[PDB]
Design a protein around this ligand. Structure first.
Ligand SMILES: [K+]
Length: 96
DNA sequence: CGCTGCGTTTTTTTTTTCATGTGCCGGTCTCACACGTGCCTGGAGACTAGTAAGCGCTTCTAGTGGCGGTTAAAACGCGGTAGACAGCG
């Protein structure tokens, strides 16, 4: 009956196994991938949070995220993150 | 006395060994990844409801030219000096 500390480690595995199905990952290295996601979570949730505050909006939409992601991410990483982002919202709304 | 070159003795530079740490192969042991199982909480469903936000229309600002005039500011160039870069101890 211990606290119950969540993480992202099961999703990192899931994606590790998609991209390098034969490869694995040490505790320390997952620990890093965990920090990484929370870090770029907070970074985006913030810039979005601002964008909204700055334009007197109460709702963080996908539009805010896309701006956050343009702002926070470099040239080529940005173009793709937007795309997989765009792609995922589009796939979700059609799906159901 | 002064020089001059030429065999000597040393110095510089080359060639070959040589002792060193490299990263390279293949067998043992450890504890960490991965699985799994079972329980529990947090996401999903769905429907309710109340309000944010987006679009059009109303106004009027504050942004974009554009027009000459004068002046302060750039341009350019020449002339020399001190500071950058190498070389010696
Ligand atoms: K205006």
């Amino acid at each position: 009956k211990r606290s119950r500390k969540e993480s992202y480690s099961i999703y990192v595995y899931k994606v590790l196994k998609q991209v390098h199905p034969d490869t694995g990952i040490s505790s320390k290295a997952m620990g890093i991938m965990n920090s990484f996601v929370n870090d770029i979570f907070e970074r985006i949730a913030g810039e979005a949070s601002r964008l909204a505050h700055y334009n007197k909006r109460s709702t963080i939409t996908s539009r805010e995220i896309q701006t956050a992601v343009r702002l926070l991410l470099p040239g080529e990483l940005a173009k793709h993150a937007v795309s997989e982002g765009t792609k995922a919202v589009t796939k979700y709304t059609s799906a159901k």
